[PDB]
Paper text:
We determine nine polymorphic crystal structures of the APR segments of glucagon-like peptides 1 and 2, and exendin and its derivatives. We propose that the pH-dependent changes of the protonation states of glutamate/aspartate residues of APRs initiate switching between the amyloid and the folded, monomeric forms of the hormones.
Two polymorphic crystal forms could be grown from solutions of APRex-4. In the case of polymorph A, side chains presented an unusually high degree of flexibility. Side chains of Phe2 and the partially disordered side chain of Trp5 assembled into an aromatic cluster near the solvent channel and chain termini. The hydrophobic core is formed by Leu1 and Leu6 while intrasheet H-bonds of Glu-Glu side chains stabilize the interface. The weak residual electron density around the side chains of Trp5 suggests that additional conformers of this side chain are also present in the otherwise close-packed crystals. An aromatic cluster is formed in both polymorphs of APRex-4. However, the exact geometry of the cluster in polymorph A is ambiguous due to the elevated internal mobility of the Trp side chain. At pHs where Glu/Asp side chains become protonated, charge frustration ceases as side chains establish intersheet H-bonds. In the presence of organic solvents, the exendin-like structures adopted more compact crystal forms, in which opposing side chains of the steric zippers interact with each other.
Author numbering: 1 to 6
Write the structure that this text describes.
């Protein structure tokens, strides 16, 4: 599981 916010 991977999550990124930028």
């Amino acid at each position: 599981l991977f999550i990124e916010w930028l």
